[PDB]
Design a protein around this ligand. Sequence first.
Ligand code: CLA
Ligand SMILES: CC1=C[C@H](O)CC(C)(C)[C@H]1/C=C/C(C)=C/C=C/C(C)=C/C=C/C=C(C)/C=C/C=C(C)/C=C/C1=C(C)C[C@H](O)CC1(C)C
Ligand SMILES: CC1=C[C@H](O)CC(C)(C)[C@H]1/C=C/C(C)=C/C=C/C(C)=C/C=C/C=C(C)/C=C/C=C(C)/C=C/C1=C(C)C[C@H](O)CC1(C)C
Ligand SMILES: CC1=C[C@H](O)CC(C)(C)[C@H]1/C=C/C(C)=C/C=C/C(C)=C/C=C/C=C(C)/C=C/C=C(C)/C=C/C1=C(C)C[C@H](O)CC1(C)C
Lengths: 39, 229, 213, 210, 217
Amino acid sequence: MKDFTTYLSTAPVIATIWFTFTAGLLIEINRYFPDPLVF
Amino acid sequence: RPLWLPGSTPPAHLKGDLPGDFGFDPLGLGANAESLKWFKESELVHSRWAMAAVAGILVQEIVRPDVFWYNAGKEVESPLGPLGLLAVEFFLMHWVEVRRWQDLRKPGSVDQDPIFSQYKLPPHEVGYPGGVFAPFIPGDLAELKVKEIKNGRLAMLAFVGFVMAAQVTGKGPIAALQEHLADPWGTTIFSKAAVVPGQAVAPPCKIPASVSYKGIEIPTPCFLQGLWP
Amino acid sequence: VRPVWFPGNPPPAHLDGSLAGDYGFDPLFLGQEPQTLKWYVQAELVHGRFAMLGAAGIILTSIGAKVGLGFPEWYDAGKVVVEKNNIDFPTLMVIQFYLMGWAETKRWYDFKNPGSQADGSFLGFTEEFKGLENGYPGGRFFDPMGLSRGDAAKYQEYKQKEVKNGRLAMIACLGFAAQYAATGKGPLDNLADHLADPNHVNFATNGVSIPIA
Amino acid sequence: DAALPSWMPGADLPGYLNGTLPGDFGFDPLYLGQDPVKLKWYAQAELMNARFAMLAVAGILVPELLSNIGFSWPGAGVAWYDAGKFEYFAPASSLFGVQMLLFAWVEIRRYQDFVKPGSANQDPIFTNNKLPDGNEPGYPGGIFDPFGWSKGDIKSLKLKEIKNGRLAMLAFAGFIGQAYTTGTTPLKNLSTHLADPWSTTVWQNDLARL
Amino acid sequence: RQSWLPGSQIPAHLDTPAAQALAGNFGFDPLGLGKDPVALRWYQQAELIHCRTAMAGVAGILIPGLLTKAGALNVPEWYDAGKVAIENSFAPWGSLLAVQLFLCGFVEAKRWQDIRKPGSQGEPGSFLGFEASLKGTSELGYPGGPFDPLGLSKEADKWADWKLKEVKNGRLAMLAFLGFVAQKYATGAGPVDNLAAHLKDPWHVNYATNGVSLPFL
Ligand code: CLA
Ligand SMILES: CC1=C[C@H](O)CC(C)(C)[C@H]1/C=C/C(C)=C/C=C/C(C)=C/C=C/C=C(C)/C=C/C=C(C)/C=C/C1=C(C)C[C@H](O)CC1(C)C
Ligand SMILES: CC1=C[C@H](O)CC(C)(C)[C@H]1/C=C/C(C)=C/C=C/C(C)=C/C=C/C=C(C)/C=C/C=C(C)/C=C/C1=C(C)C[C@H](O)CC1(C)C
Ligand SMILES: CC1=C[C@H](O)CC(C)(C)[C@H]1/C=C/C(C)=C/C=C/C(C)=C/C=C/C=C(C)/C=C/C=C(C)/C=C/C1=C(C)C[C@H](O)CC1(C)C
């Protein structure tokens, strides 16, 4: 399990998870707050 | 030594020192010393309360057969208001229960009369005050203690039976006994209900759900009617 | 030596039979690490206790619903309670989250630092939050009867009974969810329907479990 | 931690209460008197609050007691909470200012004697007039005790004073509570309760408004 | 050792003897903004100023507001008192703000120079002889002289207690004002009105029912 977690801690896996989280957050924000142009 | 199961081994924590010790503890609730010390007083208080309650219920039905004990809290009118009686009972019970609780947690600390300095209870054990509380002790103390705990256990089961019979048949203890003695084969709990994988029949709750007491609507539901057999 | 989940296969090295309900069941090696295993033990205990309470409540309410007592089903009890009594749903959510947050945060920081909640910073209580073992918080508050501080063998037997009953309750809660999602009725209604005709009223005839049936 | 009287026979009282202060019964569940300086200040605060509450309860109960009998005077039917908006020889503001100046003088003198015992026993105008050297804060004596009542059992009298003061403080709190709930004077509440105590209790009266 | 989270690891920068001498030390610093001792000293001064300013403002909002509920006063709401006060005033808000900025800048600059160099305001022949009283005590942010006229800071036995009553209260006041703003943007009424509305029915009048604090419910 330690080796598997270390593999999950590698740069491509971490980048994939982080970008999926960031993209999901932005998509959900644009979904609940459609068409945001100004503050 | 008599036991609750002849030929069985009593628990290690039950050495037969306390009165009424019959080696009955399958759950091991009395394994701890402090827990056993607290439960001993709990059993003694429960025993005395149940004994007085059962005797009172029987005398109530004998003297007043037209008044149901289950309805005794509703069909009794006194010049003293219910809230006043509740306040008096709350203050007196609070005083005596705090004194008893302090004696339990701190033995030999509340034996002195707070009003008169010339009155003090002699040294005793927790749960057995004595002194002014025991003006006459006819016979041995250990034998009488065993008799008291046995009568108390019987009275506890008797009160539970009183409540269940009053909720299932709607009659008092003597009335239920006479009704059972009239038709013994058709008045037992087995004759009133039965459960099978295809049908589950239970006796109806004779106690009404709501009781009107000076415009307050006190709810009076039968104890665990859903789990009734 | 001890019975394992799948007979004939040796148990894993990280499961030596010391914990309660140890049957060497870890094919994915999720609890291979010691700290992760400790965290998972506390998670399983919390899950089992919550599932036991949920299963007991569901069974009692279903018993009252089957007999003429007016009880609602478990899948409608929340709506019935919030509508029958003037109870605001977000307020109840916030109150529950406050109380659960306090209790769970104290339990969490006790897991991170064992015995740290016994310093007396919470109203002066010290021995009531010391904690006996991981996931087993003994004391006068959580164990007023003192069944964990007397007769060690009985305590171990009760630990095994607790973990097994918790696992069974978790399976029961999953069964409640699946039965409501498939049949659409209460659990006791499904039990009565099965007892009426067990050869034709089961999951093989509900039309949802087996689509090719 | 001795044979001194306690508010709970058998309870483990704190050790900072050794019976030095009058009416020590070891009653401090919140441990507010742990700090010796805080306890020293709280003793004087309790004494002052107790004496003012005693004067207040006496001044609330005496006019109502004399009003219920044939005795009559200008302010008779006015309640204790209604005496503020009464017509006097001077406006309330003027009396408030005069009393604030007078109380400022006496309170600063009392505080001076509290921070330094025996430093305020001398009369500023008449140098011959003074209080006895043996004195303690909160117990002036001298001209304040012209009858020499303190020459006897000072401990028993101090115990009586603190007990009566605590009872009067609770009585004033009860006066505020009864005036806010029943909206009637305290002696009228006492008469109403004495008419039929079984049906006139705090539970019954408060439940009738719920 | 009192902690803001029983069982949490207290930061090392908040466990030093110099940091432990600060009032209200509960080891609360998750972001680690006080790791630098100089930054910690500056933030301590900022916290003291915020505590005193918030206490004065919250008192000026709560006490007149509570007296307005009764018949003692008639002070308007804190969010509307500025307009009412400037209506029947002798100066516009701009001129008043300019005079205020000058008067506040003078004392704030003197306090800033004292923060940079403790006791530097006692330079002889610089403030018409009043410079002798402008030297603070041994603790930064706690000056004497003209400040503290009653001399309650001379007694050390209660000193450590007094500071504990100043920071804590100040922190509470700092939260109070924050609530005063949030409530104004969630109910549209004053703080006393919100308190009375909640006391009338707490199970239905709270932030879970205002429709703003919980947009997902
Ligand atoms: C000196 C203490 C004292 C005394 C002698 C009384 C006496 C009385 N109160 Mg009262 N009360 C008190 C304090 C006191 N109170 C305090 C501190 C409060 C809180 C602010 C209240 C709030 C209150 C309310 C809301 C009401 C009364 C009411 C009453 C009257 C009858 C019903 C009742 O007793 O309720 C119960 C009284 C209490 C629960 C107070 C607690 C007991 C106190 C602390 C005394 C402690 C007992 C001690 C051993 C002394 C015994 C008496 C002694 C002089 C011999 C009665 C004459 C009712 C009334 O006005 O009648 C119309 C009413 O509704 N009281
Ligand atoms: C302390 C003292 C001392 C001094 O010196 C003297 C004096 C004063 C005398 C004292 C006192 C005492 C007392 C109080 C006593 C009491 C007791 C009791 C009550 C018992 C009971 C006891 C009681 C008991 C057991 C009871 C039992 C019962 C029973 C079984 C019942 C049964 C039944 C039922 C279920 C139901 C049905 O329907 C009927 C029947 C069948 C019938
Ligand atoms: C071990 C392992 C590892 C390896 O390696 C792999 C594998 C195989 C994956 C594994 C396995 C796993 C599993 C089996 C899991 C499961 C779990 C569960 C089922 C849980 C539940 C759990 C469950 C739970 C908690 C539950 C609970 C419940 C509850 C609360 C309820 C509640 C309620 C009620 C009363 C009624 C009302 O009306 C409603 C509600 C509100 C709804
Ligand atoms: C510690 C820490 C660190 C870690 O690491 C992280 C974290 C978490 C971030 C943290 C926390 C923080 C916080 C909480 C903060 C807050 C603060 C505040 C709130 C302030 C206020 C503060 C506040 C303040 C000053 C205030 C003040 C006020 C005032 C003046 C007022 C005034 C006024 C008045 C009288 C009245 C009129 O009519 C109006 C006006 C004109 C309006």
